[PDB]
């Protein structure tokens, strides 16, 4: 059971592990997240609903006036994505919000029966996400990368030494909300508990409890266990708890009843403890000396005087005991504090605490945050309540509350966003438990503590900021104004909200130009996770621990895909099967194992859930529809891996691929490649420029098709049916009755995008896959995108490669290529560049776009037409004028020479300059397209007007063909419905189709169908009118441009670049190279058969690199092509469909334990010859990642091709004809041409423009810059002798202004003398030091 597009070309699968779950939609994250932000939910606070209910209702300071939110609505987008990209505008929907101004009476108590004004106000346009997952901001496609941050909740951490060479581990708790001030608790070397509010200055931890209204005795009752001391007759007694002592040393002789249990000065073991507990020991007699040091719990006062004998939390003595006895207290509650397990921390912290009561504590807190400002009681209560106990300034969020409650071992997940008094104490309790030794520290890098924010959360936050800025304005105007004349829209401003959101989608670090070199680049960019940007880490902040692979990354984050750079470890590609949980943690699918039998029941487990279960490995062998074959299965739990029995196994990895990301999944023999090289391989696949002919990969994995489809760059069939009309522009499909809805006409139109510019100026071209009259199913590829073969992803071109040295032409990774590659235009690449020419208005006057340009050859003006615009189709080269432009010059006081010169030619050429847009130097292309944007008031150019004539008539034709094909397809249905219960075949075709409004039949369901088709026909009739008026308006519309700008002409050039020495090429195992030489076909090593090799790569760049994948790819590639060469030979000689069928079935069903079955047979003869015709240019094979082809399977495949098992061949030198002395590994490596072309990197400069302040030449090729002569490079000249070369580089070559011109003149004069001076940078330095008020004179000789 295979689909139609798979019947055309089947990939052979060497995988053995049946996939229970298919690869999901890869662009899930971006779409779900943003969809939640815009999604209208009444209850579920997500995006805007949440944002409005959070801020609103806003009530005035006076309390008479209030503004309340009803609902919102997004207007439809003013411009489609297409018009936005061309015009250079943001693709957005207008946000209209219903708001109700309600007013109260001041005279009545809270009478709402005065004024209720309700109206729909504009607050900004919100940028919309494309169906692909991108935003178009100012006509540029951008991706907002999902973010990875610390989940709100609690975290318990500890400086492991660091502070105090004492080497004390200081434990701390950090409470992180989603919004609000941070609450820190920490220990000090002296075991005093401290609180930092908002990481300000230190305060004693007990002070915060006093602010929450805790008496001293209540605090102590919270942290400490009480120990009772009874004073009986004269001897001292204390109420014993059998264990408490436990692992202590007995300081007194412990006697119980009359009989001695402990010996004094011996350690109390488990036996003593169980003896005492079983004897039921509750009183023990003790010496008076033991209480010296014990801490009293409560306040004990003299009932006679009524004065305090001892305050709570005070160290007892023999005399205080005596005074207590004689007052009449024969029971003393003392703190249990035995070091070790129960530490007196809070007891010691109370002694450090300078504050006494609640007020004194609130004042001290107030004084910390606002130091200097006098306390008021109202102010201190207000500040403390507004810190962590205000619903408006503090919000843990659901995830914060949930992680908080789980960390404190609660049962309930959901609760208050504000901190309760119990929360804070529980946190302090856990901190102190961890200090004692029971309980552990949380790990920050653990994915259970790192949460994912995709777009919608971030758009939501910026939108809340906008609202908050508005709330101040609104509340301010509600109080000042008269309430009754004043409506809500005069108070609201749209520009703050629009500005907040604009700054996120345009200025933000996470909003970046989509990387569109190739489909994989796009798909991987959209599933990126960054720990950087706002609310995240910085490169400075980022250590070594965060960057490295965490155990929990298994199945969630790729371990082998991260930029090799400063961003190494902060930026992460998402794993294949990974997804976001409801709270935003990453989760991974796992197959439930029940009673040892491995069900297809699939559970997504979060980082924290995963720790708890034992998960078997994917490679673990299952036994035919039940349990594990092997007794001791290799599994992982508690973040570490070993053998387990079958009964212990809870779960298993869904696929072998789930560990890896998308990009790395496309690497065939990943299993045989070093992880470093593999990283750069997955990284270079993103740099692959699509060639002119998109060639499939012979050695694939199977992710090829998934990636091509999910990327969206391919046109995929929604409805299916049969293709009515193919064209190099469009595909119209007639839908099948079963999916075809009876309402609208059932004809799908996919318009294909032709040769369009990418962000990296690569070429985006869609070609049709299917032929005219082809039956297709839902989810079939209808048209191939730029780097896609029939449905599969095709990033470059496979080639006959031989591993062997050449005459140093492959020295260090250098690549030797055959001329045949260039001839066959393989790795020929298309670049579409967009150049704009802007006509601005200056103080002197408007710039003119005439062809009438001072001092210009007829050669140049030949290519410009009446208006001054180059013709479509015109080939151009550097310096040719594309759009002629002249700028008004003010009265030109000329040098006498120029007066003479302008007098000689008489070409005074009026008061105007030459600012024409001309082709950049050395770039050369054909003009494919021209666009003109004019404003409204200025009279249009003749060429601008003819452009609009074309767009208008072309628009009319497009819409007309829409209505025509839609009407034909709609009446074709009415014709079939009318036949249903009314045979009039020949009679209905004769009368005109235009007079079919009269035609009906009897009142049944079929008459209602006729009514549907008739209402649609007329709907399309008016729709066509309003569509055409829209198009006409946009074509006439003097687009609103930047101020100053009258019009803009955009020229699109198409350049064909040939492969050439200096161009960078790589494979998919991170194996790079620069092309050194293009060898004539004659020279290249050739086979016994006479066939020359395409590429000669250096053997020595494999064993050092430890990417053995490339060699396995080469052996299999040759075997694949071996079988393609057999099929090619059988197709050349026609032969039998029966014989081809035999060979091809034996081939597909080769592998030792091939998962994929192919019962050829069912294929019809026509399907088989179309399949063979595709298999002829080499049978495509799939080697999954970690479940790939075995060496023995590859050698078996080679034998089927009659190729050698060694995959080494005899080669003959093209030059000499003699044989190479030993066999050479030859086969097919799929190779990629990366974006790094020498054409773009080659740069040279003799003299140019110079920098503004420093007077040094500029940097960069775009600015025609000199190479930087850095400190490092200077030192080299210092080590040598070379003093003149150095001075040259410092002086006449850089700053020295006089020196450089003088030496230029000397070099044309052929003097080659320096005449050095003073570097202008130094003159500046002096001036900058004198500006500091330091006298820095230069003493003369």
């Amino acid at each position: 059971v295979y689909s139609y597009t798979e019947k055309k070309r089947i990939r052979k699968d060497f995988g053995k592990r049946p996939q229970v779950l298919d690869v999901p939609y890869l662009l899930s994250i971006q779409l779900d997240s943003f969809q939640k932000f815009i999604e209208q939910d009444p209850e579920g606070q997500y995006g805007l609903e949440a944002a409005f209910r959070s801020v609103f209702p806003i009530q005035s300071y006076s309390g008479n006036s209030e503004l309340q939110y009803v609902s919102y609505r997004l207007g439809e987008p003013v411009f489609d994505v297409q018009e936005c990209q061309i015009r250079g505008v943001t693709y957005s929907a207008p946000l209209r919000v219903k708001l109700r101004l309600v007013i109260y009476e001041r005279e009545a108590p809270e009478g709402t029966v005065k004024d209720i004004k309700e109206q729909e106000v504009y607050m900004g346009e919100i940028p919309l996400m494309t169906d692909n997952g991108t935003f178009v901001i100012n006509g540029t496609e951008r991706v907002i990368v999902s973010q990875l941050h610390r989940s709100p909740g609690v975290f318990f951490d500890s400086d492991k030494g660091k502070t105090h060479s004492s080497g004390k581990v200081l434990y701390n708790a950090r409470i992180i909300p989603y919004r609000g001030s941070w609450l820190d608790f920490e220990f000090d070397p002296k075991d005093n508990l401290f609180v930092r509010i908002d990481r300000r200055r230190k305060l004693p931890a007990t002070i915060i409890l006093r602010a929450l209204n805790y008496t001293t005795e209540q605090i102590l009752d919270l942290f400490f266990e009480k120990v009772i001391f009874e004073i009986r007759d004269n001897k001292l007694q204390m109420e014993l708890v059998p264990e408490r002592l436990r692992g202590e040393t007995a300081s007194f002789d412990i006697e119980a009843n009359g009989k001695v249990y402990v010996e004094k000065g011996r350690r109390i073991t488990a036996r003593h403890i169980r003896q005492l507990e079983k004897d039921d020991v509750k009183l023990i007699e003790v010496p008076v000396e033991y209480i010296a040091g014990k801490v009293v719990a409560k306040d004990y006062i003299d009932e006679s005087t009524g004065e305090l004998i001892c305050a709570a939390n005070m160290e007892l003595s023999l005399d205080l005991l005596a005074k207590l006895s004689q007052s009449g207290h024969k029971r003393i509650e003392t703190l249990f504090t035995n070091d070790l397990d129960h530490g007196p921390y809070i007891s010691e912290t109370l002694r450090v605490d300078p504050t006494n009561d609640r007020l004194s504590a609130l004042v001290e807190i107030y004084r910390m945050m606002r130091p200097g400002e006098p306390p008021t009681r109202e102010a201190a209560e207000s500040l403390f309540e507004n810190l962590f106990f205000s619903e408006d300034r503090y919000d843990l969020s659901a995830v914060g509350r949930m992680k908080f409650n789980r960390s404190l071992l609660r049962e309930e997940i959901e609760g208050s966003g504000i901190l309760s008094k119990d929360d804070i104490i529980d946190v302090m309790k856990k901190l102190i438990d961890i200090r004692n030794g029971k309980g552990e520290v949380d790990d920050i890098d653990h994915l259970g503590n790192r949460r994912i924010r995709s777009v919608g959360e971030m758009a939501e936050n910026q939108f809340r900021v906008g609202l908050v800025r508005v709330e101040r304005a609104v509340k301010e105007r509600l109080s000042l104004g008269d309430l009754d004349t004043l409506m809500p829209q005069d108070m609201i401003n749209a520009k703050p909200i629009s500005a907040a959101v604009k700054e996120f989608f345009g200025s933000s670090q996470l909003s970046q130009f989509m990387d569109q070199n190739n489909p994989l680049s796009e798909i991987t960019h959209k599933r990126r996770i960054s720990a950087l940007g706002p609310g995240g880490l910085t490169r400075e902040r980022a250590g070594f621990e965060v960057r490295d692979v965490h155990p929990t990354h298994y199945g969630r984050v790729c371990p082998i895909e991260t930029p090799e750079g400063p961003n190494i470890g902060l930026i992460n590609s998402l794993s294949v099967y990974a997804q976001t949980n409801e709270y935003g943690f990453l989760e991974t699918p796992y197959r439930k194992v029940t009673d040892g039998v491995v069900t297809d029941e699939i559970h997504y487990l979060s980082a924290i859930e995963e720790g708890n279960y034992v998960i078997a490995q994917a490679n673990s062998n299952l036994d035919e529809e039940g349990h594990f074959v092997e007794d001791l299965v290799t599994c992982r739990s508690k973040g570490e891996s070993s053998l387990f029995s079958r009964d212990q196994v809870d779960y298993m990895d869904v696929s072998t691929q789930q560990v890896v990301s998308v990009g790395a999944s496309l690497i065939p023999f990943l299993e045989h490649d070093d992880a470093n090289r593999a990283l750069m391989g997955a990284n270079m696949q993103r740099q692959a420029v699509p060639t002119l002919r998109a060639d499939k990969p012979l050695v694939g994995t199977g992710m090829e098709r998934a990636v091509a489809v999910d990327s969206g760059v391919t046109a995929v069939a929604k409805r299916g049916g049969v293709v009515q009309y193919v064209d190099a522009s469009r595909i119209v499909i007639k839908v099948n009755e079963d999916e075809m809805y009876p309402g609208e006409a059932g004809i799908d139109i996919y318009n294909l995008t032709k040769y369009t510019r990418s962000n990296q100026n690569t070429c985006i071209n869609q070609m049709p896959c299917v032929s005219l009259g082809e039956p297709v199913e839902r989810g079939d590829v209808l048209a191939d995108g730029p780097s896609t073969d029939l449905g599969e992803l095709a990033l470059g071109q496979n080639m006959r490669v031989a591993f062997m040295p050449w005459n140093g032409y492959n020295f260090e990774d250098s690549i030797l290529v055959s001329e045949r590659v260039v001839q066959e235009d393989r790795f020929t690449t298309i670049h579409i560049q967009e150049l704009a020419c802007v006509s601005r208005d200056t103080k002197l006057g408007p710039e003119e776009i005439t062809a009438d340009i001072p001092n210009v050859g007829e050669a140049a003006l030949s290519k410009l037409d009446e208006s001054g615009i180059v013709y479509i189709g015109a080939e151009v080269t550097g310096g040719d004028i594309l759009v002629g432009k002249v700028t008004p010059k003010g009265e030109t006081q000329l040098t006498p020479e120029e007066k003479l010169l302008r007098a000689i030619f008489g070409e005074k050429a009026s008061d105007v300059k030459d600012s024409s847009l001309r082709v950049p130097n050395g770039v050369s292309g054909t003009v494919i397209d021209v666009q003109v944007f004019t404003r409204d008031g200025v009279e249009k150019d003749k060429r601008a007007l003819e452009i609009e004539e074309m767009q208008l008539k072309q628009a009319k034709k497009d819409l007309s063909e829409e209505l025509q094909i839609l009407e034909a397809g709609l009446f074709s249905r009415i014709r079939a419905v009318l036949v249903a219960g009314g045979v009039e075949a020949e009679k209905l075709d004769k009368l005109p189709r235009d007079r079919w409004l009269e035609l009906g039949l009897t009142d049944e369901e079929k008459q209602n169908q006729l009514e549907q088709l008739a209402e649609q026909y007329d709907e399309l009739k008016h729709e066509f009118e309003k569509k055409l008026e829209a198009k006409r308006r946009k074509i006439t519309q003097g687009d609103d441009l930047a101020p100053g700008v009258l019009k803009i002409v955009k020229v699109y050039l198409a350049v064909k670049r040939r492969i050439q020495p200096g161009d960078k090429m790589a494979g998919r195992h991170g194996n790079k190279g620069v092309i050194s030489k293009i060898n004539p076909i004659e020279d290249m090593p050739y086979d016994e058969n006479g066939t020359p090799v395409d590429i000669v790569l250096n053997p020595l760049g494999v064993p050092s690199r430890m990417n053995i994948g490339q060699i396995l790819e080469t052996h299999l590639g040759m075997a694949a092509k071996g079988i393609g060469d057999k099929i090619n030979a059988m197709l050349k000689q026609q032969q039998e469909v029966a014989k081809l069928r035999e060979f091809i079935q034996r081939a597909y069903d080769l592998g030792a334990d091939v998962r994929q079955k192919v019962d050829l047979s069912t294929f019809s003869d026509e399907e088989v010859m179309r399949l063979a015709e595709n298999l002829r240019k080499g049978m495509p094979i799939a080697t999954p990642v970690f479940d790939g082809a075995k060496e023995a399977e590859i050698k078996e495949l080679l034998k089927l091709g009659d190729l050698p098992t060694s995959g080494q061949i005899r080669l003959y030198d093209g030059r000499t004809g003699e044989q190479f002395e030993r066999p050479v590994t030859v086969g097919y490596m799929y190779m990629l041409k990366l974006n790094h072309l020498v054409d773009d990197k080659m740069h040279a400069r003799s003299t140019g423009s110079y920098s503004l302040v420093t007077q040094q030449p500029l940097g960069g090729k775009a600015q025609f810059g000199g190479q930087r002569f850095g400190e490092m490079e200077v030192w080299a000249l210092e080590a040598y002798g070379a003093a003149y070369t150095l001075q040259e580089m410092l002086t006449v070559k850089s700053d020295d202004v006089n020196g450089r011109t003088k030496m230029y003149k000397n070099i044309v004069d052929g003097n080659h003398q320096m005449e050095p001076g003073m570097p202008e940078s130094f003159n500046v330095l002096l001036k900058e030091i004198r500006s500091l008020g330091i006298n820095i004179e230069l003493e003369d000789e």
Binding site: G75, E125, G857, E897, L900, I904, S1249, G1259
Partner: protein, 277 residues
């Protein structure tokens, strides 16, 4: 550890007396008559009002402290032109003055290229109109749309919105990281490259050699006119001051010098070669 200039100043203001109605009247009568202490006490007591106004219009241009000092200048003019004879309170009158001086300062100091209040006021009306347009047109105001609403010239609206264009920092590094500042992209325009300056040297040197190649009387009225050898660039009629003293003979000889020189450029290999230039 109170180090902050703002927190110190606000501490000092709080330490002041708050004035009543009868106290305001007593002090105000003495103040206008020219009491030292009365002026000082009325100013010091009403500093609080300045702050509740300067903190109100925050994050709009200048900083709080800067907005407080300028506001204080309004307080002084307010105390100077207060009328205690009118029953109406001081706070009411002062609020006007403080807002006036703050707004005026914010209109001048804020913009690097200094903008006149007349253009600023016009700008304000354009912007308020844009706001009302934006609320009803889901899109933003066009220049022409604003011009239609105010019944004013499109050119005038465009000139104003151009002046609104606020200034980009040159010293600011752009490339996301501190990679390259704008200064280093932007070249010195007024300064010619050594290539262009050397070309002018060649022309100048050539002219000197070209002057000693034509007729002695053909390069004595051609250069002394254009100001090549002479000191001042004279005209056909003004060459008469030297020795020529002619109008016709000067014009025939000027052009005779240029015609022989046109053939000197056709033979050396320029003429149409150096015409493109």
């Amino acid at each position: 550890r109170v180090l902050d200039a703002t927190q110190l100043y606000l501490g000092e203001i709080g330490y002041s007396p708050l004035l009543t109605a009868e106290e305001e009247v007593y002090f105000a009568r003495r103040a206008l008559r020219g009491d030292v202490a009365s002026r000082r006490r009325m100013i010091e007591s009403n500093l609080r009002l300045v702050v509740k106004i300067a903190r109100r219009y925050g994050n709009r241009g200048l900083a709080l402290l800067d907005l407080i000092e300028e506001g204080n200048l309004g307080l002084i003019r307010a105390v100077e032109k207060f009328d205690p004879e009118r029953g109406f309170r001081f706070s009411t009158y002062a609020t006007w003055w403080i807002r006036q001086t703050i707004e005026r300062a914010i209109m001048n100091q804020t913009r690097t290229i200094r903008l006149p209040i007349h253009i600023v006021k016009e700008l304000n009306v354009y912007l308020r109109t844009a706001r009302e347009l934006s609320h009803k047109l889901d899109h933003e105001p066009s220049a022409e749309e604003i011009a239609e609403q105010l019944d004013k010239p499109v050119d005038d609206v465009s000139r104003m919105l151009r002046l609104n264009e606020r200034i980009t920092s040159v010293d600011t590094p752009l490339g996301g990281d501190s990679e390259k500042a704008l200064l280093d992209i932007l070249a010195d325009e007024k300064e010619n490259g050594p290539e262009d300056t050397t070309q002018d040297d060649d022309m100048k040197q050539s002219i000197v050699k070209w002057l000693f190649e034509l007729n002695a009387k053909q390069r004595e009225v051609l250069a002394r006119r254009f100001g090549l050898l002479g000191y001042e660039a004279a005209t056909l009629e003004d060459v008469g001051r030297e020795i020529g003293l002619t109008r016709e003979r000067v014009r025939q000889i000027q052009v005779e010098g240029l015609r022989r020189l046109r053939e000197i450029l056709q033979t050396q290999g320029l003429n149409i070669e150096a015409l493109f230039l």
